Structures are given as C-alpha cells and as structure tokens.
Symmetry: C3
Subunit: 486 residues, 3 copies
C-alpha cells in the first residue's frame, strides 16, 4: 500500500524567464504587456476628435476657403491634424504664438463661431479685397473669417471698431497685419504711409507697424500676412484702431474648456468606435500595466515601455527550486492529475487514483491571483497627451521634453523587465514550497508506519484502505496502530 | 519541550504580494500624512509675507502695500491666489514670472535710493493718479517717479546710476501708454517720444503706444514696466523725451540659492520646518507622504497612496517554510520575552529584531532627498511650458507610487516568510539535537 | 556536506544585514575615467579653445588659430571664453544656435556676398576693439557697410541658396553712441535694416543712445541669424547700420549633441560616453563619475559603491544550512561552491559537487547579467544651455535631472540590497538541498551526526561513496 505527493503538469509550451534561469517552461502564464490595437481612430471617453482633414488649425480658424468641407463639431476631445497639412495660410505669412493656440484648441468643451464685427458695417472702407493666393474658382478670394480693410474712394479714414464680449464665454479672437512688397502697393491699398495696427483689451496692448520690404515669392506673393490672437474675457472689450494694414476679424470663437488634450498627427480618419486610450496606429483597450504600441498616445494609457514580452509565470514549472521538491526529489509531474496544482496518488487493493488537494491548490490559486492583480491594479494611471508641439526656435524646449519622455521610458522598462524577472523566480519557488509543505504535512502524520521511499511516496507498512487514505489527506490519521511492527 | 512563536492582541493589518488583510503582531507605517497646519520658517529663515500684495505691487510701491514687514533675508514667498493689490495703475510687467522666480529666495535684499526725486529739476515730478489713490487724493507707486512736462517744456530727460553698493542691483522702470494724443501732449508736450535704457548688457528702446482701450480702474491708459539686474560696478543709463516712469530706488540683491512662491491664505506662525506645504509643515524621517503636492524644502516623495505599511513583527496567529500558522498551528500569548522560544530564545529573537531593523531602516534611509520648490509660475503664453512641467511632475508621481506600493507589498511577503523560517530553523535546531531520545509529536 | 570558503575580505550589504563578508562579489557601479577628452563614436569634437561659438562664427580675429573640422560630434567650449564678441553687443537666440551647432554631420563655409561687390559703399571699416596688431580690424566673416563718398545709397543684396544644403546665415545691426557717429558713418538718420526669406521677415531700426563703455565702446552690435532653406533666397535691404555677412555656412544634421564645458584639450582616444573629467568605458548599469555626460552613458547615481554578492557567505539563513547547522566552510574544497568530504579507510578527501555548483554559477550569472543587460541606454547630452531670462527653464531642467537622480539612486541601492539577501539565501538553499538529497538516500544506514555529516553503520568504500554522490546508492 502507498500514498504519493505530486504536482500538476499539462502540455503547455509557454516559456517565461526568471532572475536565475531563462526559457523556463511553465504550466500557465499571463502576459501583462499590451501590444495590440484596433487600427481605428476613435472617440475618446465618448467625445469625438476635431477632424481637420488636409487643413491646419490656422487654415481652419482663418477660414481658408480650402477648409470649407470641415465637419465642425461643438465639442471635441483631441485634434486630428496631418504631418504637413496642405491648406494653411493660403496667403503667405505667419501666426504668432501658434503652438500655444493649438495647445488651447486641442480640447474644447464648447466651441461656437459668432459674428462680432459684421463686414457690412465697415462703411468708409473697402471690404471686398481678395487674392488669387486664396482663389476660389480662379477668382481672387480671402479667408472667410477675416476682412481685408483697404482704401475706399481714395481715402482711408482711421479705422475704428470694438466689440464687447457678451456671449458669456471666453472668446478667441484673431487679427492680422499686412506686409506689402513695396511702397507703391502700400499706397494703392491704403493711401497712407505711416500706418499702424492697434489692438487692446483689459489685458492686451499691442501696436504693430507694417514692414515694407522685398521678399522671396511665396504663392507668387512677396507680401505677407502676420496674424496674432488673444482670449477676450467675459464682459471685457476689444478695441481695434488702424490707419491701414489691419486684417480684422468678422467672427469670434466662444470657447470653453474643460481640460486639455493634444494634437494627434495621422493620415487616417475617424471611425466610430470607443476608447479611453488612442494611438496614431489605433486604439488600445486594456487593463494591462504596460504596452509598446506607440509612444504618442492620448488618454488613460498604460506605461509605454521598450519590451517585446513581459510574461508572468502563474502556474508551476511544467515537468514532463529553493525547496527542492518540484523537479527536485519529486522527479516529475503528473498529467494524470487534473483537479488542481498539487495532490496525491495512492495505490490500494480497492483501486489506484489521482486526487488534487483542494485546500492547498485553492490557497495557491488565490495567492497567484493576488500577485497578478497586485502587479496590475497598483499601477497609477492618469490622462495625458504625450505628443507635443514646439516651434523652430524651441528646439531646446522640445529636447527637454524628449530627455524627459526618454527618462521615464528607461525607468519603466528597466523596472517592468526586472519586476517580471524577480516576481517569476518567486512564483516558481512558491509552487515548489507548496508541494514540499504538502509532502512534509503527510510525512509528519504517517511517521513510523511507512517506509519513506524518496521519490515523494510513502509505502505503508500497515494496510491503508480508502477510509485510511482519506484520513491521510484529511489531517486525521492515527497512528495508534501499530501494525507494524508485526 | 516546545517550539513556538509570539502572538499579541494586535489588530494591525498589512498586505503582501500573495495575500491581503493579513494581521501582524507589530507594523511600521512609512507614509507620512500629517502636518502642523502652520506656515513656518524654512531652515531657520522666514518667508516674505506679502499679505494681499503681489510681488509687482510690493516692488513698485503700491501705496496699498505699505503695511508690509519687509525682511532683509527670506527663504520662500507667501503670495495669495489672486492678490488684491498689484498694479494699481493698469498695465503689465515684462518677464514677470522670471522676476518672481529670482525674488523667490534672497540671502540679502535692501532698498537704496539711486535717482533721488528732487534731482529731476526741469521736469515735473509730482504726478499721481486716483487709480493709486491714498485718501481720495491722486498718488503713485512710492518707489517710482512719473516724469512729466515742466513749464511747457520736456527737455531730454537723462539720468544714470553707477552701481557701487557692492551687490547686484535689481532696477525696475516703466513706459506710459496714454489713451489719446491729447493726453500725451498735456503730459509731455512732445509726440515722437521714446524711452531708452542701457547697460553693459542691456539695450532697450521703447516708444509709447497711443490708442483707445477698455477702461481699467476707469483708466484707458496703461503702464508697462520692465526690469534689469544691474551688475556690480556697471552703470545704467536712462534717456527719454517723454513717457518714462523712472525708478527712485534700486534693490541690492544677493542670492544664495533658489526657492519658489507658495500660494496660501494663511499667515506665518513662528514654528520650524525643513519641509513646508500649503496645508502646513511636514516633520518626518519617512520616505513618502501624501500631504499635498506643492511643497518647498527637503520633502519626502509625494505619492498617491493612503497607507504604506511594513509588517515588522510576525503573523499574529491566535508560509514558505510551513511553520507559522503551519505545522505549528498557533501562537502563544504566554510568551512575552521575544518573538520565538520554547521562555523566548534570546539569540534568535535578537538576530531577527536586528534584521527587521535593518530592513525598515534600509527602506527609509536609502531614500535620496534634496531641496525643491515644485509649485511653479507660468504666464498665459506658457500653457505648454506649464504642461511640460505637469507631465513631468505626474510622471514621477506615477513612478514613485507604483514603486512604494509594490515595495511594501513585496517586502511584506518577505518579512513574514523571514519570521516563518526563523521558527522553522529554531524547530529544526532542536529536532537535530534530540534525535533518537524523543517522540516527534 | 559542505560549502566553499576562501580568504576573501570583500563586504556586501543585504536588506537584513550589513558588512557581510562573501567569497566573491561584483561591483556594478562604474567610477573610473581615462582623464581624456575623446572622439565620440569615432567623430571628433569641435575644439574652440578660448573662443566662443559666437566669436568663431563671426570671425573674431582672435579665433583664427581654430582647427575647423567638417564634421563634429560635440563641442568643447570653456566656462567663460576669452574671445567672443570683440565688438560689444549681443546675439539673438544665441542658445538655440549653440544647440543647433552642437553636432554637425557636414559644415562648410561658403562666400555668398563677396566683399568687393559692395561698390557704392565703404567696405573697409574696422575697430580697435577688434584690433589685429594695434590696427583696427573686424569680424573676418562679416562686412561693415558704411557711407561712401558722402552718400549711403539703399544697400541691397540677396543670395539664392544653391549649395544643396541648409545654410546658416548671420547678420548684424549697429547701435551708435550718438547721432553724430551715426551721421559720420551712414549720412542718413531714419535708417533700418531689413532681412527676408520665404519664412523670415525682420526689420530693425538702430538704437542711438549713450551707454557704459565696453572695450572703450559705447556703441553696440546686435547679431541675429536664420537658417536659409534649400533653393530659398535671403534679401538684405538697408539704408544704414547693417553689418552684412560675407559668408554663409552649409550645415547638415544628423542628430543633436551638446556643449561640454572644460579646460582640457582633445586627445585621440575613443569612447561612447564622455564626461568633463574624462571618458567612461563600461558595461555597468550605473556610474557616479560626473553628471554632465554626453553619449551612451550609464545611469548617473548618488552612490559610492553598489556591490552584488555572487559567491556565498564566507564562513571561516532562510534555510539554516550555511553558518547554520553546518557551522563553517571548508578552505579545503577548491573545485566548486558545494561538495562533500567522506572519511574512509582508503583515504580522506574533498570533492565539489559539479552539477550543483554548475547550476548555481549559471544562475548567479543570469542574475548579474540580468541586472546589467536589462538596463535601457540611449544617447543624451545632459549639460544644457539657458540664458539669463531663462532661469525657470533652467530650473525646470534641474528639477527633472534631480528627479531621475533620486529615482535611480533609490532603486539601484535597494536593488543591490534586496538582490543580495536573495543571493545568499540561494546559496544557503543549494547547500541545504544538497544535504537533504544525501540524507534521503542514506536513510536508515547512517547515524545523522548533526554537523552536516553522516556516519555510516555499514562500511562505505570508494565505489559506495561515489554512489552517494552519484544518486545511486542502495
Ligand atoms: C567710423 C568707423 O566706421 N569705424 C570707427 C569707429 C566707429 O566710428 C564707431 O565705433 C561707431 O560708433 O570708431 C573708432 O574710433 C573705433 O571704434 O575704434 C574707429 C573706427 O575706425
């Protein structure tokens, strides 16, 4: 008669690494590194992204005619722009503090255009000036949202125009100053020569004089338009005053935020799925602590890491350690045991059998669960934008960001790598111990009444029927008997 | 003879990688969460208290900022969120954030008269404004001087100052932007005016901007202040045909190091600290805290946790080695001398208490801690710079939290196992001696 | 059953103890340099000597002794360079320029507005502030357009960039001390300097005012720069006060490095990691040589030692074998970490257990290797450049650099500590398992002494012994 102590072993080929070994085969394993996406650009926490198509934020805001096909939502959560957008400043020039503007617009709670200096009211000034650089149908046109004030009659009276912001939200307002190619152009557009463009608020005070000079031709244009912007507060007013060269707004933009997102560079288009974490390659949907999909994410994302696999062993070493039981003094595992991780055999005259030890396999499965769950749910995860915008005179600011983004990459990678490695030698040892303790718990009961074979089995001197066996696995067994002895 | 382990009446719970809600005999918390609700001196030196004033209001001499204490040496700055008294006269202050950063912590700071008001003969020196009113009557930033037309003549205003006070000197100046060409004339006569400021390093020329504006404090005009740091033995040259708001005083400034501005409603209180938060002052040897993210001084790592508890004693039983709560079913309340015993085993309880000591001490004293400001200042055209700081401050938050959480968790399954082993080794040390002469129950 | 013990005095620390002596140990903290400034990944650094980037580019006469490579990987500048703007003034967006020039793939000067062609303008103006041999001179690379005859015609000059690479171009605007100087240099008074490209549009008027004298000069020169694109043109136009370029700079990059402040000179050695104290050459994960590095460097940490135990506790734990129920180690055993003794009537002996010492040495190898080769390492510059109106940007960088210092230090410290209590326990276990593997075989036929030895009842000749170490025996 006999009773044995053994551990599970299936047909798995899953490999994990531990601090001390590598290519170690285990019965079951969990991967905690997310690497898959749904190849779609999506709504972020339920709200869509502003799709710009081929347009740039500047082109959109200014009303480039080439940007008319734009959807124009009231509320968006990030911005889809392209790398190198085709239609921006149709009329050559520049946009002051442009990055900051995009950062602002990167995520809006409510955003609505409103007419604030209607085109008609500029009597005493020519209002219809366009340019073939903004051509709609071969004919000269102009940024829809703006107005090109030029000489009327042969007289450019001091252009004055203000606007009290009453729409009950902060208002974004953009304006411009035109830089002619030559003093003639300046005159045949404005009459005056010593001109200036003056913009003021409770907070702003900016005066600009135009720069008349020859320049390389852009879209056949040597002249330039320099746009600036401010955020007109609630109940505050904005005062325009100019003797020429002002490109004034027709429209404002009520804007309410909310929070702050970022601009996502991509060729793709919105697609009507959901996500809490969007990449330029697609959307991530995971509970996992780490991923390697793409560094430029937006939303609540896992830690981006430079790894290809991060695998936790969860089951035991598959054997077709610290305590020397598994693949130790117990040479191999039993495919025959299916109920659980560890258990017994017993060879009787009533029949042979396998039977997992419920209590020990339970206490273990629960533990390994806490482990995996711990590695996963202790990870703090907030909402970030990552991808960022910097000008050409900001290569250092940009590089400071990169030094920082890299720093965290290195830190998270080294940790997640070693976390898996260290936690894995522990897990195996854990299983090994459990078995070794299960072995010892029987050896200590049986004591004198069994030969200790050494393969992890015990050969009973006395006969040990089913009931008896069950007492050995019970915790009963005793012992008085004695027998033998004889 | 018996082999057993200690077990008191504790209810203290810790978590381990493998289990949670585990009860241990004794435990240490390494997360600091308490403050003394006071704003305090930092490393012995006080903070500049601004009260309702803004740094700008203070420096320019807003009349509303006269009640200010004005120490010679401070270690941080107490400002409010939305200070009532700043630029009484509407306008702006160039490179303001940078200035605040500079002034955030001074080793020595002392006002000195450098272009005395009197000496501006040939210029009217007494101009004020009801926007800076003291007692219904028009007044003006005390530290500044409003040069205006005298007689009906504004001669080229010239004034220089050689810095001899043997310290770097902060100097602030201004350019007035009138509401209309009339105001400009009835203040300065001239129309094509400019304000010129120069040093060995500085060269700035400004023309005033005459334009209509929204009224602020009933004022459409504006004042635009700029500043420089005049070096030792260097000179500053003012020159102007109008619209210059020149300084009467400079500020000798020596630093030292660098602190930061702390936003708070509260007032200084005469306690000490090496670590100040807006909620109060922290006093701890602990490696982590969650008091408030905006700290100044030598602080523990700010972490997003509520508890971080190290088990130190053993599992309380009223593991890897299967002794504790294992083949030895329970603990003895009867044993009081130490952790394990038969009468506690002095040598084994000692070697263990020493070990668990090294553990806790190691977790605590390996933490590198330097002096930082955290809270920071950024303008409106700096929302990105600001956001870059937040992405970074968050990044570290996530890193430290994830680590401290798991550190506690991992180090706790180890500690218990440690105890378990010690017992099991104590048991084996006896079983191996006794051998043949005892029944092994 | 016993374990190895040599004559080592090497000490490591563990979570639970300190000053623990082990048989063998590995240090993973690099602290040594070769005291040389070196080529970085095969390419040399631009050596500036006493010159500043500005002095170099503008052609300060004092900067003629410069080597001038076509391709460099970092820049050697000094803290407080003697020769920069010989003529007092300033340089707009200077930091950014240095950052750009910090590392070039190809860099070559080319004449783009030859001095001669400025007829109708005096081209020979110098200054004793840029004196070569007591005589007035001027930035070699620049040209001081001044009145010719008594007439300063509108100065015009353009240049189409055809050299097939981005071109750096620097220009200047002169700020006279007084309206007289302005006239006796340019005739005109309402002057302006105008510079344009497809992207640039800058107009500057000179500032005439009195100033503290620098190099006996109250006047000032204010230089600005742009990056003229391929096939783009740059248009100068000026009625006075323009200090125009004679030369451009073809520039191609590549990547991005940084400026290294040092007194020393290039030396013809190699490195992938350069510090201001010398060059690092290591596979180690951490170092404490100096924080301002350039290249692929280990993590800079605030430690003095970071030592992994690798061999076992030297005894002249969790499992209670080493320094436990087996009181000491055997100097007699040399073959490996653990093994047996056996006292026979054919002779005594020592003999390490090959299979167990192997499996262990392999493991401890994976450990060290793992700590070392999982460390992600990229190329960075660290040291950085910020102006005086950037004390915040600078401080933001310091808060960040510190942040990582604290993080890496706390981790490497604890990594070593934790991994070391594990390593010792590991050895302890291996022994204890070796002991149990024999006890389980021998069973009934031996008295179990208790010192880690077994006394055979039956006689156990050589063959027999070998069966005990075999795995046979029966
Ligand atoms: C006139 C000219 O082109 N260069 C002359 C300058 C300039 O007049 C002033 O530096 C500009 O204000 O004056 C010098 O005395 C000088 O600087 O050494 C001599 C030099 O030949």
């Amino acid at each position: 008669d006999q009773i044995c102590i053994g551990y599970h072993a299936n047909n798995s080929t899953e490999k994990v690494d531990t601090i001390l070994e590598r290519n170690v085969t285990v019965t079951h394993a969990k991967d905690i590194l997310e690497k898959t996406h749904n190849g779609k650009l999506c709504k972020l926490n339920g709200i869509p992204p502003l799709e710009l198509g081929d347009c740039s934020i500047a082109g959109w805001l200014l009303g480039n005619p080439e940007c008319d096909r734009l959807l124009s939502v009231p509320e968006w959560s990030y911005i889809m722009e392209k790398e190198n957008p085709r239609d921006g400043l149709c009329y050559p020039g520049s946009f002051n503090d442009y990055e900051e503007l995009k950062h602002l617009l990167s995520s809006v709670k409510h955003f609505e255009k409103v007419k604030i200096l209607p085109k008609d009211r500029w009597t005493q000034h020519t209002t219809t000036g366009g340019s073939r650089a903004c051509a709609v149908s071969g004919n000269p046109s102009f940024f829809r949202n703006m107005v090109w004030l030029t000489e009327k009659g042969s007289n450019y009276p001091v252009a004055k125009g203000s606007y009290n912001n009453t729409s009950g939200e902060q208002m974004l307002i953009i304006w411009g100053v035109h830089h002619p190619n030559d003093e003639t152009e300046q005159r045949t557009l404005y009459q005056n020569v010593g001109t200036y463009v003056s913009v003021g608020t409770s907070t702003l005070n900016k005066r600009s004089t135009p720069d008349i000079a020859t320049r390389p031709k852009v879209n056949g244009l040597g002249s330039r338009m320099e746009f600036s912007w401010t955020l007109l507060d609630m109940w505050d007013t904005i005062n325009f005053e100019s003797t020429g060269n002002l490109i004034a707004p027709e429209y404002g933009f009520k804007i309410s935020k909310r929070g702050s997102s970022g601009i996502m560079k991509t060729e793709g288009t919105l697609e009507n799925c959901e996500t809490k974490c969007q990449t330029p390659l697609g959307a991530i949907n995971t509970t996992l602590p780490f991923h390697n999909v793409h560094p430029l994410t937006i939303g609540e994302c896992p830690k981006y890491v430079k790894s290809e696999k991060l695998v936790l062993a969860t089951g035991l070493r598959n054997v077709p350690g610290l305590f020397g039981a598994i693949a130790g003094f117990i040479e191999g595992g039993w495919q025959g045991m299916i109920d659980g991780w560890y258990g017994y055999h017993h060879s009787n005259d009533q029949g042979s059998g396998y039977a997992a030890d419920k209590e020990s396999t339970q206490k273990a499965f629960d533990g390994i669960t806490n482990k995996v769950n711990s590695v996963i749910e202790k990870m703090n995860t907030q909402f970030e934008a990552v991808g960022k915008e910097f000008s050409n005179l900001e290569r250092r600011l940009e590089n400071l960001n990169k030094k920082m983004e890299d720093g965290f990459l290195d830190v998270w990678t080294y940790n997640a790598e070693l976390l898996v490695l260290m936690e894995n030698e522990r897990t195996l040892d854990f299983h090994d111990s459990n078995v070794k303790n299960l072995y010892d718990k029987v050896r200590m009961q049986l004591r004198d009444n069994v030969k200790e074979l050494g393969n992890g089995c015990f050969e009973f001197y006395h006969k040990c029927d089913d009931e008896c066996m069950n007492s050995v696995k019970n915790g009963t067994y005793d012992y008085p008997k004695y027998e033998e002895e004889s």
